[PDB]
Amino acid sequence: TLWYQTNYVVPPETPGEAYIIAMGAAQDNFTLKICKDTDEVTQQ
Amino acid sequence: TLWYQTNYVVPPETPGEAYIIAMGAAQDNFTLKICKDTDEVTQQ
Amino acid sequence: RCVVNRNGVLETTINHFFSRSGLVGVVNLTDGGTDTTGYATWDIDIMGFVQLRRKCEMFTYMRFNAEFTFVTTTKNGEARPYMLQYMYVPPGAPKPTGRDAFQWQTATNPSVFVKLTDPPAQVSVPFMSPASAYQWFYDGYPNNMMGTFAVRVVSREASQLKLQTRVYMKLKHVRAWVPRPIRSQPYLLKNFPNYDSSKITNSARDRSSIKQAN
Amino acid sequence: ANIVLAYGEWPEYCPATAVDKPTRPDVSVNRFYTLDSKMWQENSTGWYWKFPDVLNKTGVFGQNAQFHYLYRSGFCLHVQCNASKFHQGALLVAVIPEFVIAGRGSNTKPNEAPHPGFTTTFPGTTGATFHDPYVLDSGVPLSQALIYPHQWINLRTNNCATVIVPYINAVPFDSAINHSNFGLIVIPVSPLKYSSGATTAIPITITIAPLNSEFGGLRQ
Amino acid sequence: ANIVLAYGEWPEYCPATAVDKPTRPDVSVNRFYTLDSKMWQENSTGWYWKFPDVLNKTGVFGQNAQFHYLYRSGFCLHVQCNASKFHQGALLVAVIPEFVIAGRGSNTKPNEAPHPGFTTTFPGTTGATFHDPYVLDSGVPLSQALIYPHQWINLRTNNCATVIVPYINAVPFDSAINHSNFGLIVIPVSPLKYSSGATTAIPITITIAPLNSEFGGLRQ
Structure with a gap:
């Protein structure tokens, strides 16, 4: 979860609307087992 | 005294009205003698 | 004048700031007849007068011994030789x-x-x-x-x-x-x-x- | 960053004569409890928090402080106030040991005079706003409130403050529910100003780290 | 901070053949005399000051320079120009030895041609504004006025300048009243610009330190 701790304070002559880019990845602990085909493809 | 040397210059999108907080204290040279009761209290 | 010399550094300690014999309470005794009052108690609180209360609300914690001096007068002022009993009741003991x-x-x-x-x-x-x-x-x-x-x-x-x-x-x-x-x-x-x-x-x-x- | 140490002492453990050794979690309570942001505006007055009942409803510290009987801990306060470079103003942040909220009224009779309620003395995790910040709602002027451990949050120099405060009490152990130990006060001495088109309110964020916690007398 | 040393020499004392040794105050004259702030605007032209008659009315230096007869001192100039980060413009600050104000007119007869008055040649502690800053009010172009000791005050890089200038004269002692030694010139080469709602004028503050002063021939 991502909560609104205090508030988005902003000075004048500045837009009070911004964005947050969220990214994600694995670590050195991440390991995989038992290979199999994907199902993103619909056609054959 | 506190004088207005040059001017209060200000860019746009910024208020041209600010404040100054004045504080004050003693030093290591400050010493006191002959104790006595205060007179801030009116009642008895 | 013009005080150029330095003052004393002993009258600003806390011990000197508080230690002095000051008046803290006034108790009225009557010793009547039909209305058998006889005695007069006085709970100990140093916050009674507004002169030491302002000096002791300057600090959060305090630790001190006390000396109590009892000066009893009559109504007019004359002191006849009557025996008096002062009694200290510790915290927890019942009042008379x-x-x-x-x-x-x-x-x-x-x-x-x-x-x-x-x-x-x-x-x-x-x-x-x-x-x-x-x-x-x-x-x-x-x-x-x-x-x-x-x-x-x-x-x-x-x-x-x-x-x-x-x-x-x-x-x-x-x-x-x-x-x-x-x-x-x-x-x-x-x-x-x-x-x-x-x-x-x-x-x-x-x-x-x-x-x-x- | 400048760290103000409250009265020059670090929070340390108890060196008491209790055979039941007080427990030390060290794992799930020494984390950054982040409170909600306060929306500071032009007509704002200030805020105050009572600490040992701010975190009595939040997670492991609240559970281990409600179901115990003896409590002793220090604190690491960290207050951000992130504003733009076109806003102006100043905040005064200060901790006060044994901050007793007074009652506002003009009555001298004992059981007729007003007294603050439970939501005024113990606000909880949402704090409470001052009614008269000039007297700290205690009849004591805030102009000489710099005798306490304090910092200034000036919106043209920095945006953060931090206060490491030890355990200040006459008894080394105390109930964490029936006695609030010390309070945090933020006051806008200089008001907030901004040109039209900017953000009309500045958030204030507070994070707390319970350094060196000790609990005793576990019960239901 | 960048310090420009005028002609690579520091102000030093006189190594003259006068038996009456010139006095050295060292105490009440080596203090920061701060002049009033100049209100720089869009349609401004510039300012110039004549130094040994700027501080002839101000305090110990003025009293000890009016009632003496021989004078020799260096100077430490320090000019702040504090503006916001949304203003833009540029100033050129430069000292000029023997800065003679010319007269503006189109007359070639000797006692018919115009000449500057006393309040134009010797402005005093309030300075004077240029009429034609393109020719420095001397018929000499300001585009090549960088031959003098100078700095640029660019409102996007810094806000301060400093010039340590020694004593430049053909005679090691001179009257501090009847001869202005050198002048300070600030010129807005690039004009001031700002969006609507900002401060319509920028202050310029100047402080002066009379380094290595020497006075001679005390009289009433």
């Missing part, structure tokens, strides 16, 4: 309820037998708190701190005078912790720091302009 009750003959309530023609009475009370220091500002939710103080006229029958005792308190061996600012608003109660929402007194008296030297 009558002039001839059994709380006066109790052996664990230390008494002082002194006459009116004698020099005034003088006792010393140690640090009697279950904590490590006294504290007037208690922020939270939970009676008595130092002990009760009674006095009567030792006699088989009842005398026909009304006395007037002054309990002068002196502090000794005082230690303080956690200083806090000095209260500017006037008082309203005895055990609570209640100020008045309307009529807030300014802590600096007014002048004409900001650009002057009034």
Whole structure:
């Protein structure tokens, strides 16, 4: 979860609307087992 | 005294009205003698 | 003159700031007839007058011994040689309820037998708190701190005078912790720091302009 | 960053004569409890928090402080106030040991005079606003409130403050529910100003780290 | 901070053949005399000051320079120009030895041609504004006025300048009243610009330190 701790304070002559880019990845602990085909493809 | 040397210059999108907080204290040279009761209290 | 020399550094210590024999309480005795009052108790609280209360609300924690001096006068002023009993009631012990009750003959309530023609009475009370220091500002939710103080006229029958005792308190061996600012608003109660929402007194008296030297 | 140490002492453990050794979690309570942001505006007055009942409803510290009987801990306070470079103003942040909220009224009778309620003395995790910040709602002027451990949050120099405060009490152990130990006060001495088109309110964020916690007398 | 040393020499004392040794105050004259702030605007032209008659009315230096007869001192100039980060413009600050103000006119007869008055040649502690800053009011172009000791005050890089200038004269002692030694010139080469709602004028503050002063021939 991502909560609104205090508030988005902003000075004048500045837009009070911004964005947050969220990214994600694995670590050195991440390991995989038992290979199999994907199902993103619909056609054959 | 506190004088207005040059001017209060200000860019746009910024208020041209600010404040100054004045504080004050003693030093290591400050010493006191002959104790006595205060007179801030009116009642008895 | 022009004081160029440096002053003394002994009158600013906390021990000197508090240790001095000051008046702390006034007790009225009547020793009547039909209305059998006889005695007059006085609970020990240093917050009684508004002159030491302002000096002891400057600090959060304090630790001190006390010296009590008892100066008893009559109504007109003359001192006839009557015997007097002063009695210290420790915290937890019950207060005396009558002039001839059994709380006066109790052996664990230390008494002082002194006459009116004698020099005034003088006792010393140690640090009697279950904590490590006294504290007037208690922020939270939970009676008595130092002990009760009674006095009567030792006699088989009842005398026909009304006395007037002054309990002068002196502090000794005082230690303080956690200083806090000095209260500017006037008082309203005895055990609570209640100020008045309307009529807030300014802590600096007014002048004409900001650009002057009034 | 400048760290103000409250009265020059670090929070340390108890060196008491209790055979039941007080427990030390060290794992799930020494984490950054972040409170909600306060929306500071032009007509704002200030805020105050009572600490040992701010975190009595929040997670492991609240569970281990409600179901115990003896409590002793220090604190690491950290207050951000992130504003733009076109806003102006100043905040005063200060901790006060045994901060007793007074009652506002003009009555001298004992059981007729007003007294603050439970939601005024113990605000909880959402704090409470001052009614008269000039007297700290205690009849004591805030002009000389710099006797306490304090910092200034000036919106043209920095945006953060931090206060490491030890355990200040006359008894080394105390109930964490029936006695609030010390309070945090933020006051806008200089008001907030901004030109039209900027953000009309500045958030204030507070994080707390319970350094060196000790609990005793576990019960239901 | 960058310090420009005028002609690579520091102000030093006189190594003259006068038996009456010139006095050295060292105490009440080596203090920061701060002049009033100049209100720089869009349609401004510039300012110039004549130094040994700027501080002839101000305090100990003025009293000890009016009632003496021989004078020799260096100077430490320090010019702040504090503006916001939304203003833009540029100033050129430069000292000029023997800066003679010319007269503006189109007359070639000797006692018919115009000449500058006393309040134009010797402005005093309030300075004077240029009429034609392109020719420095001397018929000499300001585009090549960088031959003098100078700095640029660019409102996007810094806000301060400093010039340590020694004593430049053909005679090691001179009257501090009847001869202005050198002048300070500030010129807005690039004009001031700002969006609507900002401060319409920028202050310029100047402080002066009379380094290594020497006075001679005390009289009434």
